[PDB]
PDB file of C-alpha atoms and ligand atoms in Angstrom:
ATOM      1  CA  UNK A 578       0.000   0.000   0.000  1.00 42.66           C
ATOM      2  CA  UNK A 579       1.272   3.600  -0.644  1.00 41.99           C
ATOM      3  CA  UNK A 580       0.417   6.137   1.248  1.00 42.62           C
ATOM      4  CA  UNK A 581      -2.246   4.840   3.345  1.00 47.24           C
ATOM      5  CA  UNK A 582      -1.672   4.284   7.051  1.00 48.75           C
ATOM      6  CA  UNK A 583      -1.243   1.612   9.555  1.00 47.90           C
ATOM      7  CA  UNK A 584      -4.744   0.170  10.363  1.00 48.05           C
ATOM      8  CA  UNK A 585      -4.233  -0.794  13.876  1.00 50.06           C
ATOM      9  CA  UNK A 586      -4.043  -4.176  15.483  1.00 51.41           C
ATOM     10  CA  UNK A 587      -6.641  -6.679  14.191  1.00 46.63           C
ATOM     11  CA  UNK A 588      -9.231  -3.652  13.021  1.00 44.57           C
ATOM     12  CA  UNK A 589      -9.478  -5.441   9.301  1.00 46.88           C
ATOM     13  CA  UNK A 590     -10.269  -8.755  11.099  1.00 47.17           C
ATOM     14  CA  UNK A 591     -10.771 -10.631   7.949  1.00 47.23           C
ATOM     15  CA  UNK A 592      -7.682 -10.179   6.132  1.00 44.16           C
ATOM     16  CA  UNK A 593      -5.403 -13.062   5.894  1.00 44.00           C
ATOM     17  CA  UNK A 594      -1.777 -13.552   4.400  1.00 44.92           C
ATOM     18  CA  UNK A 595      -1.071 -16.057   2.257  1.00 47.15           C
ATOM     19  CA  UNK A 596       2.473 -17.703   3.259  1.00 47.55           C
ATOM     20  CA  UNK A 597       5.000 -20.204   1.946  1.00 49.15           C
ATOM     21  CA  UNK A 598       7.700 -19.060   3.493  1.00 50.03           C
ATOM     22  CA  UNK A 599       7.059 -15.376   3.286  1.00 55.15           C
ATOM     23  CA  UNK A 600       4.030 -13.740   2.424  1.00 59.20           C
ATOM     24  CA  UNK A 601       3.127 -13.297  -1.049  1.00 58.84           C
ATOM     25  CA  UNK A 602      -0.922 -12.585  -1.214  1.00 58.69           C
ATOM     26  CA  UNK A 603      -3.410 -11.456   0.749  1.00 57.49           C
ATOM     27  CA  UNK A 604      -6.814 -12.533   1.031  1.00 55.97           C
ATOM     28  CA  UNK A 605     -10.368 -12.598   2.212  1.00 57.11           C
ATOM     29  CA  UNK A 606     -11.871 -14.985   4.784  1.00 57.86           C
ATOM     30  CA  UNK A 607     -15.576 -14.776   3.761  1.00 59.98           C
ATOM     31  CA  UNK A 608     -16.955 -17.964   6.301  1.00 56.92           C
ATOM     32  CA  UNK A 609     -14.991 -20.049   8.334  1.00 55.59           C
ATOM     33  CA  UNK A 610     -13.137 -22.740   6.021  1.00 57.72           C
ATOM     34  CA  UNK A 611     -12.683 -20.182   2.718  1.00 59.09           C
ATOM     35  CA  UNK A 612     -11.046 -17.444   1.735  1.00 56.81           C
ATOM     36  CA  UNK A 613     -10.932 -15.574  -1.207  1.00 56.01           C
ATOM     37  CA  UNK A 614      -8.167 -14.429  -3.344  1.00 56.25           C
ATOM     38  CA  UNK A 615      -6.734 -14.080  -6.881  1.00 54.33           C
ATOM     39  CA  UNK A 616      -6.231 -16.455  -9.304  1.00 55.24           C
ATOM     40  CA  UNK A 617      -2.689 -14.914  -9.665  1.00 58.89           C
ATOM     41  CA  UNK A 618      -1.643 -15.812  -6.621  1.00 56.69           C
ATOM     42  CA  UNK A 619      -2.032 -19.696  -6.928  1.00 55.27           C
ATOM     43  CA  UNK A 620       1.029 -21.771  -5.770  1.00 55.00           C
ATOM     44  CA  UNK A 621       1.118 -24.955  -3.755  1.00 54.19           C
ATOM     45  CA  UNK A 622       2.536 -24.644   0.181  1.00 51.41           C
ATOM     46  CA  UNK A 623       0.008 -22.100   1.225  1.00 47.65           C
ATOM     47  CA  UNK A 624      -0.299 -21.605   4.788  1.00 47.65           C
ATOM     48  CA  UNK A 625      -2.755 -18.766   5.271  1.00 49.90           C
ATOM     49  CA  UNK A 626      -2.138 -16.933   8.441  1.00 49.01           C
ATOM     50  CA  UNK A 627      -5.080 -15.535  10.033  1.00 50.11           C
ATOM     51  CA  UNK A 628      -5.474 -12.668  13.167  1.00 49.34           C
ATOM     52  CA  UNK A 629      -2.408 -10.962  11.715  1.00 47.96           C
ATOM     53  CA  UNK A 630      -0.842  -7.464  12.003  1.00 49.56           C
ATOM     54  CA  UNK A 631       2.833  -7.530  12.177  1.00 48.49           C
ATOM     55  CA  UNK A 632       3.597 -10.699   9.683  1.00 47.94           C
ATOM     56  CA  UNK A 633       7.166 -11.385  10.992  1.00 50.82           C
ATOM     57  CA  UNK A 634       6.792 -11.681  15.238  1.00 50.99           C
ATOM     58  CA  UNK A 635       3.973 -13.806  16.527  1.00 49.60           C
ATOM     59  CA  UNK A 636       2.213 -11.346  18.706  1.00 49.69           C
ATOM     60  CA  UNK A 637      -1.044 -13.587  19.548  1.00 51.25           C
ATOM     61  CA  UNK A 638      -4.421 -13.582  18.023  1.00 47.05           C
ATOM     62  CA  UNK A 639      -3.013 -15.274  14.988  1.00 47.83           C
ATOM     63  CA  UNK A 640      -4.263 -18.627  13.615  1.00 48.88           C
ATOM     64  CA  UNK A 641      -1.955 -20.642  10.836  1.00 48.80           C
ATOM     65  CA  UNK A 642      -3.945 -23.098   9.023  1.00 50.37           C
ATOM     66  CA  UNK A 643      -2.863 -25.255   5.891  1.00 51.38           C
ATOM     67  CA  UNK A 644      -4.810 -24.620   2.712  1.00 50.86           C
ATOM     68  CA  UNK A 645      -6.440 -28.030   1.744  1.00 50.47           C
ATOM     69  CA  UNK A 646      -7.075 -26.921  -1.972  1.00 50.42           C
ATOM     70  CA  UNK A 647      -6.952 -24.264  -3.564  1.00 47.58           C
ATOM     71  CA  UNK A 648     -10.087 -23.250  -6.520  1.00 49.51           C
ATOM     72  CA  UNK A 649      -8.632 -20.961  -9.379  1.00 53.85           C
ATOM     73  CA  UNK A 650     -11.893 -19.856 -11.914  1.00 53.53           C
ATOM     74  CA  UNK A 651     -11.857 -22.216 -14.623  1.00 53.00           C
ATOM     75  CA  UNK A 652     -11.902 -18.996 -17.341  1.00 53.10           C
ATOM     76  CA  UNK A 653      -9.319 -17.382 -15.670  1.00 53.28           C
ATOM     77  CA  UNK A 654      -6.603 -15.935 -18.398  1.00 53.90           C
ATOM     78  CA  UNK A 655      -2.929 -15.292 -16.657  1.00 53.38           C
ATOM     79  CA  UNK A 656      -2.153 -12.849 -19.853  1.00 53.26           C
ATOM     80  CA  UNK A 657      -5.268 -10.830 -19.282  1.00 57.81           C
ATOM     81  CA  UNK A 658      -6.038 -11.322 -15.499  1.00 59.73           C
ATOM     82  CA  UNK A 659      -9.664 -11.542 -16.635  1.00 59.59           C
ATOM     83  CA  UNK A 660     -11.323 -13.510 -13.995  1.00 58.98           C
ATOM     84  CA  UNK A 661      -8.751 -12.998 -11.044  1.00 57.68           C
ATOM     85  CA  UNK A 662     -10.188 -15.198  -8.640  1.00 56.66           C
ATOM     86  CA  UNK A 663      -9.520 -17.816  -6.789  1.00 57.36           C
ATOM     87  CA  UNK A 664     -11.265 -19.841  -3.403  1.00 53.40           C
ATOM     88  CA  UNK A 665      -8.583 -21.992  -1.092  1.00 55.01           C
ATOM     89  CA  UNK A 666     -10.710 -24.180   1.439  1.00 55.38           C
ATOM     90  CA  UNK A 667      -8.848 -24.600   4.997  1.00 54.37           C
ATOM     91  CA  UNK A 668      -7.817 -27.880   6.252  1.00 54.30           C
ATOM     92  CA  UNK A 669      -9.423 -26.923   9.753  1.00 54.25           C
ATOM     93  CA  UNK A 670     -12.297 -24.221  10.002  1.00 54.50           C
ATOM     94  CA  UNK A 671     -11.327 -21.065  12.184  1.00 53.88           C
ATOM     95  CA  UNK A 672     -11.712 -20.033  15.529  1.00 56.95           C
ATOM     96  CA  UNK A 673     -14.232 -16.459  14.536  1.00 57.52           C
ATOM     97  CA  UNK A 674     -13.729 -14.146  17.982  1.00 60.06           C
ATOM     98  CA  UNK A 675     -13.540  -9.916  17.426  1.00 60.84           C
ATOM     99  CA  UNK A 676      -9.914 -10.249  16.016  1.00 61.01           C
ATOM    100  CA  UNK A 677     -10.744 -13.063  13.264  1.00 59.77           C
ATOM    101  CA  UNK A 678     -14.003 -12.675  11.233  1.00 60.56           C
ATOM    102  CA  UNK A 679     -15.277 -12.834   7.954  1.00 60.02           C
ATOM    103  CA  UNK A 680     -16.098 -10.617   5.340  1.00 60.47           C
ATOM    104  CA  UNK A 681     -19.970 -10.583   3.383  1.00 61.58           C
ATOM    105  CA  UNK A 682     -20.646 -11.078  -0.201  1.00 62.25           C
ATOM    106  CA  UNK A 683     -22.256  -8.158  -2.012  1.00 61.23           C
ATOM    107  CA  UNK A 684     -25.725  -8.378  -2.921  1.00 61.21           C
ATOM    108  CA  UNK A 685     -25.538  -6.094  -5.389  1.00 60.04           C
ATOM    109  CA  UNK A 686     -22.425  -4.255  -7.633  1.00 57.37           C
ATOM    110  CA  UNK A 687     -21.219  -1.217  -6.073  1.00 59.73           C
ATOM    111  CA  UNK A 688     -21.185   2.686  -7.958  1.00 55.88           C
ATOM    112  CA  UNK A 689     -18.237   4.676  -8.709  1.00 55.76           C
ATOM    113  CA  UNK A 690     -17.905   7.163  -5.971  1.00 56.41           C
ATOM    114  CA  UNK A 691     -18.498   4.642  -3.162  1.00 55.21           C
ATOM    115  CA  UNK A 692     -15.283   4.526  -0.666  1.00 57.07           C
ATOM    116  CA  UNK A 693     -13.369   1.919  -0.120  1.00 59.52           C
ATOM    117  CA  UNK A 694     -11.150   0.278   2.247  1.00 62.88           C
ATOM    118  CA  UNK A 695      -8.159  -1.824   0.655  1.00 61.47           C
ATOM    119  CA  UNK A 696      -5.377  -3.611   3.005  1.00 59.39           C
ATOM    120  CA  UNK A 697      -1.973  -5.063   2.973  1.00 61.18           C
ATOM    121  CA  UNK A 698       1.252  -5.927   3.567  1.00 59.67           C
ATOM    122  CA  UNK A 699       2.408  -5.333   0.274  1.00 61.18           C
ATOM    123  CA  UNK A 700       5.396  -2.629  -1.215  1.00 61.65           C
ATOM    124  CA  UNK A 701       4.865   1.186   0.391  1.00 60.92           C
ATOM    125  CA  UNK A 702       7.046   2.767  -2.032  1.00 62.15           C
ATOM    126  CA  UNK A 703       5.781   4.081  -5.407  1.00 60.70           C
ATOM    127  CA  UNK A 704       9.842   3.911  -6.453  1.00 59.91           C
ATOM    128  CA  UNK A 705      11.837   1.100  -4.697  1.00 60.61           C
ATOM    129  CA  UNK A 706      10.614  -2.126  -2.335  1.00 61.79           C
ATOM    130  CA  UNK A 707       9.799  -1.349   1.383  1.00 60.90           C
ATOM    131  CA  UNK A 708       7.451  -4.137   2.944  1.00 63.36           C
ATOM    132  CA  UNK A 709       5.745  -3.101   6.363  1.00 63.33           C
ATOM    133  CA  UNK A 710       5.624  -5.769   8.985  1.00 63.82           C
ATOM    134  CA  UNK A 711       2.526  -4.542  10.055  1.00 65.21           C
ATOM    135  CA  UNK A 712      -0.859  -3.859   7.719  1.00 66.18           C
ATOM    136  CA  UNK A 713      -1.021  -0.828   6.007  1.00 65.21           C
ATOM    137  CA  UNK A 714      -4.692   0.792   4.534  1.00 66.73           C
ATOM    138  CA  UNK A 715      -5.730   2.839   2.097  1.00 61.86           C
ATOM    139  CA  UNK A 716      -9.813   4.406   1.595  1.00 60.05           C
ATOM    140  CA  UNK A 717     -10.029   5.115  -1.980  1.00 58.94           C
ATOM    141  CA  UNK A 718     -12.840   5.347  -4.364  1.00 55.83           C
ATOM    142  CA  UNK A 719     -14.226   3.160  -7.093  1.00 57.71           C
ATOM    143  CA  UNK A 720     -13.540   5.491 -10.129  1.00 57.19           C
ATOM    144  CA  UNK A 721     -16.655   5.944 -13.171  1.00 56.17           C
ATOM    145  CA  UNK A 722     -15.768   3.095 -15.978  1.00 52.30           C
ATOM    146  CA  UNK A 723     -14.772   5.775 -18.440  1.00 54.13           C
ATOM    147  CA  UNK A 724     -12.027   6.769 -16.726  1.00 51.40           C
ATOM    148  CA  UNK A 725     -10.859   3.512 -15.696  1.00 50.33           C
ATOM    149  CA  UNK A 726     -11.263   2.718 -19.663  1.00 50.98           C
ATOM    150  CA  UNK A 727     -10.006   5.684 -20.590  1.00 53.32           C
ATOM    151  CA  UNK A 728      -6.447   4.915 -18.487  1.00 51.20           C
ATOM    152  CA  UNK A 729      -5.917   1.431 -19.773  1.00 46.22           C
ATOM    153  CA  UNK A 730      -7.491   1.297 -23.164  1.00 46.27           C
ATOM    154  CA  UNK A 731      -8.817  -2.110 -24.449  1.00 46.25           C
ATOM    155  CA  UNK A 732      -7.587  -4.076 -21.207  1.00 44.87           C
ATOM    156  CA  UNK A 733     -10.573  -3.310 -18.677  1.00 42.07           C
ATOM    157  CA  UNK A 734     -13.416  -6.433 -18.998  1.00 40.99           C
ATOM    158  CA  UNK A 735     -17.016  -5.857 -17.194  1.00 42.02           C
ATOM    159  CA  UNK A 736     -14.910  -8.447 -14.530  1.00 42.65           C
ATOM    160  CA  UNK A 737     -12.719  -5.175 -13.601  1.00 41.32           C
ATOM    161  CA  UNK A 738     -13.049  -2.017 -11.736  1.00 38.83           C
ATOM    162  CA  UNK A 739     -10.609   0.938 -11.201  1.00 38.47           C
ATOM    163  CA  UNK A 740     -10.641   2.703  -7.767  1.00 38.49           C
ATOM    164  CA  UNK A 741      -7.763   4.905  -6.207  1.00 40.06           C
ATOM    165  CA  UNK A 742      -6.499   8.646  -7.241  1.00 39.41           C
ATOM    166  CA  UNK A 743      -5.613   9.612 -10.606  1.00 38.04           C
ATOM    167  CA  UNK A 744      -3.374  12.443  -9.546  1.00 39.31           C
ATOM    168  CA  UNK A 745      -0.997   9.302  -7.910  1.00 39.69           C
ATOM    169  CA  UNK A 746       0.672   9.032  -4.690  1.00 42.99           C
ATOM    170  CA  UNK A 747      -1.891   6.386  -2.531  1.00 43.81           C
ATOM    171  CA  UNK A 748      -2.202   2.892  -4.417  1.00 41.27           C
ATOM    172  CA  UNK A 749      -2.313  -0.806  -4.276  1.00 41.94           C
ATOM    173  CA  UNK A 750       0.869  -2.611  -5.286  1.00 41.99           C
ATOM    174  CA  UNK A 751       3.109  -5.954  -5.238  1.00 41.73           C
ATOM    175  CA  UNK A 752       2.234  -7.845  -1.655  1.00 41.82           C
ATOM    176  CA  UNK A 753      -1.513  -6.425  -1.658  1.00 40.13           C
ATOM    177  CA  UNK A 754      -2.764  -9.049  -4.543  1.00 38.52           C
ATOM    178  CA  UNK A 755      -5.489 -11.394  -3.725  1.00 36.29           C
ATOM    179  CA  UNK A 756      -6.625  -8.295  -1.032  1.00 40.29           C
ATOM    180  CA  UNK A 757      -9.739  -6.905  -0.134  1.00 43.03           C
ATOM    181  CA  UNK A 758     -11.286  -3.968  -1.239  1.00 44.27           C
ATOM    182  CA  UNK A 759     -14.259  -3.558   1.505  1.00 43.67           C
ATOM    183  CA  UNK A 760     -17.361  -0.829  -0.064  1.00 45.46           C
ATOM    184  CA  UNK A 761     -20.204  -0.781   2.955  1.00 44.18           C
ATOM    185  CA  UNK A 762     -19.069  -3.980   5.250  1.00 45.60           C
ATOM    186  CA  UNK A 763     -19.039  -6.009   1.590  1.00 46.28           C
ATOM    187  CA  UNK A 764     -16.470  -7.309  -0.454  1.00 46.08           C
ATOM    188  CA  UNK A 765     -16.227  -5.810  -3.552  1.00 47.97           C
ATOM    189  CA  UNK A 766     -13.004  -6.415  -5.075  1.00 46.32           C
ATOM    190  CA  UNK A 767      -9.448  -8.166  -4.879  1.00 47.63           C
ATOM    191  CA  UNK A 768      -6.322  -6.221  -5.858  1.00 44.19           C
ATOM    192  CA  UNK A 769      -5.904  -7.648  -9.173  1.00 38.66           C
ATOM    193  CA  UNK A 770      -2.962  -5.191 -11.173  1.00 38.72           C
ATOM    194  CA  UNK A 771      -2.012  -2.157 -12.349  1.00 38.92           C
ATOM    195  CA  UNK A 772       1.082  -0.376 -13.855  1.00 38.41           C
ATOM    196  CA  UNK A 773       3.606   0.752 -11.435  1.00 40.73           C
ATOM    197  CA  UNK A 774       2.206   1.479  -7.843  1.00 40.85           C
ATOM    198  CA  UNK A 775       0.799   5.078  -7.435  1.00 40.13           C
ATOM    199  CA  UNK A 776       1.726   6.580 -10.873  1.00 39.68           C
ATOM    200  CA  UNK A 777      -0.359   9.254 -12.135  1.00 38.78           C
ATOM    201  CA  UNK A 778      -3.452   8.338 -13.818  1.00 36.73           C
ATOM    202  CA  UNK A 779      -2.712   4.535 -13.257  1.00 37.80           C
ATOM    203  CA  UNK A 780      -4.985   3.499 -10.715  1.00 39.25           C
ATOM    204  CA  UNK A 781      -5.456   0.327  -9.257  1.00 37.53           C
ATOM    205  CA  UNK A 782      -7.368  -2.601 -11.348  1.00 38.31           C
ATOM    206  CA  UNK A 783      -9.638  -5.092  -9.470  1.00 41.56           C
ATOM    207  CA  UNK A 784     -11.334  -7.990 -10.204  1.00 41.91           C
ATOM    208  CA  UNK A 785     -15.711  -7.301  -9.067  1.00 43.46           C
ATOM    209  CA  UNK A 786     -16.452  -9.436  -6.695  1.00 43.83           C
ATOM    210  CA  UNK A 787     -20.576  -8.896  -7.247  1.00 42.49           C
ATOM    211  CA  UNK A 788     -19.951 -10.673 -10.882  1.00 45.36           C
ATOM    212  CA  UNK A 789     -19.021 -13.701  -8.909  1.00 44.64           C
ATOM    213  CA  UNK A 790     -21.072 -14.359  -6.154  1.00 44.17           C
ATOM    214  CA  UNK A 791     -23.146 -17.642  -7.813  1.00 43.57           C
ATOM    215  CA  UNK A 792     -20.129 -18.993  -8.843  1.00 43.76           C
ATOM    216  CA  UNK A 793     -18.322 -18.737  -5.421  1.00 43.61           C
ATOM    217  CA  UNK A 794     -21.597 -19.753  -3.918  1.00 42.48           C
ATOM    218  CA  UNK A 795     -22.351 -23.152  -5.943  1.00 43.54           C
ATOM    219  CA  UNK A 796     -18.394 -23.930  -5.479  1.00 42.74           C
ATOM    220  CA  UNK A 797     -18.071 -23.447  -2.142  1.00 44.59           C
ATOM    221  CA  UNK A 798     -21.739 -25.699  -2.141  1.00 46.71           C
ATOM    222  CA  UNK A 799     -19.848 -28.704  -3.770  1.00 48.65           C
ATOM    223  CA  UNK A 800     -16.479 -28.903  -1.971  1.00 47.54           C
TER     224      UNK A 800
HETATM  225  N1  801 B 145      -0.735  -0.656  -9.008  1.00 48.24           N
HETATM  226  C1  801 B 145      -1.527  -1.518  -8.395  1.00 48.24           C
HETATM  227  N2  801 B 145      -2.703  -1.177  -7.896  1.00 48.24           N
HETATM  228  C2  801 B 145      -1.124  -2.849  -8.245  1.00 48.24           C
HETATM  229  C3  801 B 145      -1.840  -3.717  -7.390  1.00 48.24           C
HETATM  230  C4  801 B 145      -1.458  -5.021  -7.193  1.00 48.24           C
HETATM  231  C5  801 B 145      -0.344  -5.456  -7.853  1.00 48.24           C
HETATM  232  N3  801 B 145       0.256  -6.592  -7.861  1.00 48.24           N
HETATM  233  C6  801 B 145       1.262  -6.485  -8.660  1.00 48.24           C
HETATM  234  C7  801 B 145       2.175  -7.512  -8.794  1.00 48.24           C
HETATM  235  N4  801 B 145       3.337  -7.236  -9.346  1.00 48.24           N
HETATM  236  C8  801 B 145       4.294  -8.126  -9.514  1.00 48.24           C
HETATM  237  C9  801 B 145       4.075  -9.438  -9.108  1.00 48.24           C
HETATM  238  C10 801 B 145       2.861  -9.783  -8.518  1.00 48.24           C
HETATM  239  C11 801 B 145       1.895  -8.807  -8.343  1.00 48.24           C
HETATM  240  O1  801 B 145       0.686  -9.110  -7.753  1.00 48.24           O
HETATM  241  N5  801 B 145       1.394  -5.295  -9.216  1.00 48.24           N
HETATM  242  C12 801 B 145       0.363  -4.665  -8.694  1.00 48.24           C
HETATM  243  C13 801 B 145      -0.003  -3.337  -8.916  1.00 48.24           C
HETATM  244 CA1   CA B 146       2.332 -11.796  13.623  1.00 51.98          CA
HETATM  245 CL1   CL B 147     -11.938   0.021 -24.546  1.00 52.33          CL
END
């Protein structure tokens, strides 16, 4: 995240880290045995790591569980990021308390304009690699589709939504993919891509969340 702040101890209690060693992702826990992520950040050896602020000293609250599988969409494209989602089921459910819950499902597709709360512990630095140990946020706000079109011409699908500033400076980046983007207490996007972190009419691409709600609903159903 650039230039957003440091949310607080376990005050985005639904936010996980995906780990294999280091974290890599983030994600969403949306019940007790799933989370949701992006399809870009499938790998095998995920640990997610739930009740987390600072990622590198075991502080308490956190919960480590193994991922049993791990669901990227079937239509996902790696070249176009269309369809950036994936589901990982937990070998164990969760303990839920205040510091570990999970995150609703929109009923319905959120309008440009609406704020939005994005998390992680991904790069702070627009120019160069600084990782925080602890979670960093950033309230930004779902941008109107011709803008977001009009910034990345012929790569935005009706999966994808801009949201951040287009004068640059606060942003998404590497180490905040497969995170949440939060609009009303529901889960609207992932952090999906962009180009650079916090560049100047680049803003941050993510994957809409309310175009997959069946699909995560019927999956989650049959495994
Ligand atoms: N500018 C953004 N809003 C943004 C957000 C997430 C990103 N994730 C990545 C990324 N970059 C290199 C490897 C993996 C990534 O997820 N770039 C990203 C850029
Ligand atoms: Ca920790
Ligand atoms: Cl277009």
């Amino acid at each position: 995240i650039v230039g957003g702040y440091t949310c607080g101890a376990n005050t985005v209690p639904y936010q996980v880290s995906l780990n294999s060693g280091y974290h890599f992702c983030g994600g969403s826990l949306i019940n007790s045995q799933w989370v949701v992520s992006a399809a870009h950040c499938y790998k095998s050896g995920i640990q997610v790591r739930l009740g987390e602020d600072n990622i590198n000293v075991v502080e308490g609250n956190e919960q480590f569980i193994s991922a049993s599988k791990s669901i990227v969409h079937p239509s996902y494209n790696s070249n176009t990021l269309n369809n950036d989602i994936m589901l990982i089921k937990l070998k164990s459910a969760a303990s839920l308390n205040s510091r570990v819950a999970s995150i609703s499902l929109p009923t319905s597709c959120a309008s440009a304009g609406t704020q939005c709360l994005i998390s992680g512990w991904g790069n702070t630095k627009s120019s160069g690699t600084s990782y925080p140990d602890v979670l960093k946020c950033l309230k930004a706000p779902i941008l109107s589709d011709s803008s977001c079109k009009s910034a990345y011409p012929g790569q935005i699908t009706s999966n994808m939504f801009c949201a951040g500033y287009l004068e640059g400076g606060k942003d998404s980046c590497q180490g905040d993919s497969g995170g949440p983007v939060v609009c009303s207490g529901k889960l609207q996007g992932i952090v999906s891509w962009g180009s650079g972190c916090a560049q100047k009419n680049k803003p941050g691409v993510y994957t809409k969340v309310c175009n997959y709600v069946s699909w995560i609903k019927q999956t989650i159903a049959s495994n």
